[PDB]
């Protein structure tokens, strides 16, 4: 799977990434992978380097990644207490995060125009 | 695939949907695919019943589906000429148009946020 | 996932099907799943037709199917009560059972060469 | 795509693979991809390193990987030369070929058994 939802009552999903659920996609031989590791650190990964991270490694025990209404990506412990937010918000809307083939990790939004075909 | 990357210079693909291509996602037993057919209309399809097209079948041959720069979705034939455009147009930048679980086809743009790992 | 493998001493997996898992495939808008139900019923389906099972719904609780070392696939209940297998056997070694586009189900083996590439 | 099934007349597919396809499939921080090229090379990667090959480039053009019917994989030029073949050969019928979880690529076959549901 490549995209997370934000939260939102409908049955996208994923819309959280708990704890050693991850992202993956393929490119030639590199693996991308973001993952929510079981030590709270959220992290991209090319095969097994490490690339990016929120550096939340030790902050909690049982975090989820979650992606809000307003675009904004919150890892949050299992105490609930939120350890890392990416640092802009949008209008509140849906929004979506995609790991992409350029190995870049980006959030669109807000929705501009759908079908509006659900069901 | 779920999503098609706006026209741009990366290796974000796909960024065309030529004819006979499409999007396709599992629902449970249903099957969604997004088609760019031979005939130049762009369907969605919930197994085989048609659910949405764009009703340009005829209209040209050889037709392509592109995501342009500022969100637009546009369905352009082998001369060249442009039988549809989706209706909303944002600044010029980068979108994704998502086939999500819910049924939906959502453009969202453009990006918030991103780690800025490309390459 | 289209395969089963033997039970064996590596890391080929999956090598169970518990309950509510399966095997899944696509063959145009039809999904072909083969799935270890509740009820204990191994089933095929062609979409929600049911096209072929091995008729033990209601015989056990919580059962699995396993493809044995000698290529014969079993039904188990959760008290290690067999209430079905495949009935031909081959020699001890590596089998797996795929299901196929053409919507047969096949158990082949056992192996007849590698390229000896493990690990 | 895991699997190429021995030559037979019937939709199960692929069962060929033509230069510059492969099998692929991911194990942790690791793509095992097995490759017909573009020189003839039929070579199975961990990443970007080569592991196993049928040290056959250079020996033509246009190459394509078959697995017979029985059981022997060869690759033959577009001039319809045979350039290589596995070395053990079965009684008449189907295989298949799989690349395994495992990194093992190992041809199975004759058929045991089937639930006899083509179609």
Redesign the interface.
């Known amino acids: 799977n490549?995209?997370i939802?934000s939260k939102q009552p409908?049955?996208?999903?994923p819309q959280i990434l708990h704890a050693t659920e991850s992202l993956?996609i393929?490119?030639?031989?590199?693996?991308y992978?973001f993952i929510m590791q079981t030590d709270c650190n959220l992290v991209?990964?090319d095969?097994?380097n490490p690339?990016?991270a929120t550096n939340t490694g030790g902050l909690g025990n049982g975090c989820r990644a979650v992606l809000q209404p307003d675009?904004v990506?919150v890892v949050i412990t299992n105490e609930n207490v939120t350890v890392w937010q990416?640092?802009?918000a949008?209008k509140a809307g849906?929004?979506?995060l995609?790991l992409?083939?350029?190995?870049?990790?980006?959030?669109?939004?807000?929705?501009?125009?759908?079908?509006?075909?659900?069901?």
């Open positions: 490549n995209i939802f409908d049955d996208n999903h993956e393929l490119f030639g031989t590199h693996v992978r991209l990964y095969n097994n690339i990016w675009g990506l990416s640092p802009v949008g849906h929004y979506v995609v992409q083939p350029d190995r870049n990790v980006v959030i669109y939004g807000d929705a501009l125009w759908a079908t509006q075909t659900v069901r």
